[PDB]
Amino acid sequence: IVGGQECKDGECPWQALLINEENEGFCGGTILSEFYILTAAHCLYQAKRFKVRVGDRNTEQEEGGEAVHEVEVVIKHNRFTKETYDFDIAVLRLKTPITFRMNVAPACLPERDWAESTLMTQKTGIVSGFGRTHEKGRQSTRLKMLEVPYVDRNSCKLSSSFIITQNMFCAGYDTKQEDACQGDSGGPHVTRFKDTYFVTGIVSWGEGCARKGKYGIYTKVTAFLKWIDRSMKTR
Amino acid sequence: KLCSLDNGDCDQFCHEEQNSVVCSCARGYTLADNGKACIPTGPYPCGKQTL
Numbered sequence: 001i002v003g004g005q006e007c008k009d010g011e012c013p014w015q016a017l018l019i020n021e022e023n024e025g026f027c028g029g030t031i032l033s034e035f036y037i038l039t040a041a042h043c044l045y046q047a048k049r050f051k052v053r054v055g056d057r058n059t060e061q062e063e064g065g066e067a068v069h070e071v072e073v074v075i076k077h078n079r080f081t082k083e084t085y086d087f088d089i090a091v092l093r094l095k096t097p098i099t100f101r102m103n104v105a106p107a108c109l110p111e112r113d114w115a116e117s118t119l120m121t122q123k124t125g126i127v128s129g130f131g132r133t134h135e136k137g138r139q140s141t142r143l144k145m146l147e148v149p150y151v152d153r154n155s156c157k158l159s160s161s162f163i164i165t166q167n168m169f170c171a172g173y174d175t176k177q178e179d180a181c182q183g184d185s186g187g188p189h190v191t192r193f194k195d196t197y198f199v200t201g202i203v204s205w206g207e208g209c210a211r212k213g214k215y216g217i218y219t220k221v222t223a224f225l226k227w228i229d230r231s232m233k234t235r
Numbered sequence: 236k237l238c239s240l241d242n243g244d245c246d247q248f249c250h251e252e253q254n255s256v257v258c259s260c261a262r263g264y265t266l267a268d269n270g271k272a273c274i275p276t277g278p279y280p281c282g283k284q285t286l
């Protein structure tokens with residue numbers, strides 16, 4: 001997260017953090033329930049074996065409310081490939097139930113039509129994670145959240161230098177030095193409507209970090225809902 | 236009518252029944268009496284900052 005604030009206690013309770021054997025945090029997640037996590041598809045490459053952590057807000061200080069969960073099964077998307085990054089989405093089923101407490105609650109999956117009509121038409125959204133602080137920086141120690149304006153779908157394709165498909169959507173700033181970044185991947189993009197946050201998008205890719213004339217490319221969640229279900233009902 | 240005016244005055248999901256609006260809520264919620272608001276069931280409902 002380049003720029004942006006810091007997640008105060010209880011503010012970003014749905015954040016999840018995939019960690020490698022080296023205990024390092026390399027990607028993010030979204031708690032969809034006590035048993036399922038929503039991550040990116042490319043986050044399922046950068047590693048051999050990994051766990052999912054929750055409740056963490058400071059990656060080096062026993063806040064007592066943290067907790068590690070193993071991965072029973074991993075549901076990666078079939079139409080996905082690195083050559084386009086299209087269909088960047090995957091769903092994790094935990095080996096043991098997430099116990100919701102302070103700094104550990106799940107986000108809501110909204111309905112498709114209502115999400116597209118009233119959520120993504122909302123001005124801004126919220127992206128969060130432990131990723132880098134500037135393009136060439138290091139994983140953050142504290143948890144960050146950035147308010148990222150929704151970007152005109154058109155501008156999106158122009159400003160980009162890659163095919164912005166229907167499964168993705170731009171978000172961020174043109175000039176301003178605020179964007180998600182490396183490590184923030186798989187993280188959660190949530191829209192806020194009446195003090196109840198919804199899972200609108202999955203952190204995916206971008207060209208650099210906070211670069212002028214470039215935006216944050218997130219995975220369109222509404223365009224995978226039915227899939228996220230058939231994934232939780234396991235399939 | 237019109238989920239366009241202000242989400243039909245709903246709390247979460249807003250839909251239309253060819254004449255009036257019908258509100259609904261996310262898993263773990265229950266639609267109140269006024270048929271517009273939503274209310275939790277557990278102490279950790281999806282979408283709420285654990286404050």
Ligand SMILES: COC[C@@]12CN(S(=O)(=O)c3ccc4cc(Cl)ccc4c3)CC(=O)N1CC1(CCN(c3ccncc3)CC1)O2
Nearest residue numbers: 082083084085162179180181182204205206207208216217
């Ligand atoms: C190894 O390369 C890393 C990276 C990600 N990073 S990154 O780790 O800093 C990174 C990752 C996810 C992000 C998500 C948001 Cl919303 C904002 C900034 C982000 C920055 C920047 C980059 O230019 N690249 C290029 C790349 C790989 C190639 N690519 C496409 C390929 C085919 N079709 C579309 C896009 C764009 C992303 O990954």
Ligand SMILES: [Ca+2]
Nearest residue numbers: 058059060061
């Ligand atoms: Ca910690």
